[PDB]
Amino acid sequence: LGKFSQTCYNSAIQGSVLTSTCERTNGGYNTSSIDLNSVIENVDGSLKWQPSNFIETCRNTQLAGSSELAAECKTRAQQFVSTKINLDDHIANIDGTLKYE
Amino acid sequence: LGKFSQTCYNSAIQGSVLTSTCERTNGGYNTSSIDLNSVIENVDGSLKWQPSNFIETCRNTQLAGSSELAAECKTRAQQFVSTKINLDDHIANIDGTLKYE
């Protein structure tokens, strides 16, 4: 798995985002970025790999009502089902700024 | 915990990002956003809460060499220690685009 560095150049990290210019199969290059926040985590001071994101396996995300996140997400069986989660559970307004807690 | 909806308005979800205009203590408002990708995950088709991000507890992220992500991260004891992870482990170049696998 991985090995992007072997066929890319001008790689850089800014915050949690990795950007690099990579070779395409038919030749030529493309510059792209990837946010590592959803795949890497800090476990007691050590960076460790983490499962994949949520937007990679869920679609049609919407704000239902005033605090509900709704979406259609893939099951282990690769089928989409309806799901929702109350953002009021952990998203707070800390003096005007949205913060997770 | 949470309860942001009670003191905010004009909330919206785009992709994995929640944006809202919230009341400040001293009065007045502030608009802010939060990327839910690092705190919510898809578990067999159901959205579930997830630990916090990595940029919230790590600082000075840098690309070391051609594929190493280096940073100073907080331990359970709240002290910063040096850590690194090889991005070549899971980041691949798929026809010119960086993708996790």
UniProtKB/Swiss-Prot annotation, chains A, B:
Application of this enzyme or protein: Overexpression of this protein to provide quantities adequate for medical use as a topical microbiocide has been attempted in a number of systems including E.coli, Lactobacillus jensenii, the yeast Pichia pastoris and Nicotiana tabacum; see PubMed:20162270 for a review.
Effect of mutating P51G: Protein is mostly monomeric and has wild-type anti-HIV activity
A biological process term (GO) from this entry: regulation of defense response to virus
Residue ranges crossing the lipid bilayer per the database entry: none
Post-translational modification: Cleavage, or reduction and alkylation of the disulfide bonds results in the loss of anti-HIV activity.
Disulfide bonds: C8-C22, C58-C73
Keyword Disulfide bond: yes
Family as reported in the entry's similarity comment: Belongs to the cyanovirin-N family.
Annotated protein name in UniProt: Cyanovirin-N
Phylogenetic lineage: Bacteria, Bacillati, Cyanobacteriota, Cyanophyceae, Nostocales
